[PDB]
Amino acid sequence: DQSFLWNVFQRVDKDRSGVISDNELQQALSNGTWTPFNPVTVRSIISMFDRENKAGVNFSEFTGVWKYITDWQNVFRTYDRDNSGMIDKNELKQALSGFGYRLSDQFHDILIRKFDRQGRGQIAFDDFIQGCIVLQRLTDIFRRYDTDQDGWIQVSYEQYLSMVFSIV
Amino acid sequence: DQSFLWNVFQRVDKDRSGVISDNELQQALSNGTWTPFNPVTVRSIISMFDRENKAGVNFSEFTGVWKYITDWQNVFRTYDRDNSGMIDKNELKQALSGFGYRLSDQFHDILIRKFDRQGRGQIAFDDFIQGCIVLQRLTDIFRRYDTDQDGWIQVSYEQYLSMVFSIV
Numbered sequence A, B: 001d002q003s004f005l006w007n008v009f010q011r012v013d014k015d016r017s018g019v020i021s022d023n024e025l026q027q028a029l030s031n032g033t034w035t036p037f038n039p040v041t042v043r044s045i046i047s048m049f050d051r052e053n054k055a056g057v058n059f060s061e062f063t064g065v066w067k068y069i070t071d072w073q074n075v076f077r078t079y080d081r082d083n084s085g086m087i088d089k090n091e092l093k094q095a096l097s098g099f100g101y102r103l104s105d106q107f108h109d110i111l112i113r114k115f116d117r118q119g120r121g122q123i124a125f126d127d128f129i130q131g132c133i134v135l136q137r138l139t140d141i142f143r144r145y146d147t148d149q150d151g152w153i154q155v156s157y158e159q160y161l162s163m164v165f166s167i168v
Ligand SMILES: [Mg+2]
Pocket: A013, A014, A015, A016, A017, A018, A019, A020, A021, A024
């Protein structure tokens, strides 16, 4: 529904420039905890859909942003079974298993610790997205190196440095 | 010479608070290119000597900062053989070999590309420090994992994720 998305775009694009900036997108997003939507997550989302290195999305690009965030909301709403604004370790295990990840139970505690900005041992919507984006990017890199598909990689000193340099 | 360092500390500590902030240290440092001293390098240096998580150094901690930066200046001044403000690949090879690193010729191009903010294919003083801090930290992690000291490591999927999570 382009007519619906256009009216949304106009309300988010507060400076009426035709480009939604990081700050404009952040102000339009709720993370369900009454704190600012994780600005790293916002930057990740804008960068994924901005095809012009302009630190923002135009209307065509925003239609993708809106579907992306809506799809994420639908996943999170499914697994936040108590409507608390955060999913717990068991719910995170189910959600990531639904994406196809193969992760030990104990690694889910590591993931929550790494990405939960609230510090309560559960994970809110904005931090959930960011953790999943990172997990996909890191797993993609591992899949490239694991050419024998055994779950293990072997790398030299300089291969390891180059691998880290590709990450950060 | 505490009397000399005290007078330096007073001039850098512009707000006269007894704590030199990141911004105060940055304003006191020249990177020899007439651009602001790399703020990542400044943050790395403050964090290394601040024992109190106060985003700054007191006078005792600053005596360490001053010796640290002075030691780095002495290394860089040695190898900037044309007094240009930047060292080239050959000079970088010598400097890092002097620190004990074992790096192929081609990896020095990778290092320069990764850390040279000026974009000229050489490396200035502030970027040199930051690259060396990162190289030490990453090599330290590799040394921990390379228990057979052969220059190769083998890691599982979850070991790799945990390793990356320790880096960034
Ligand atoms: Mg705008």
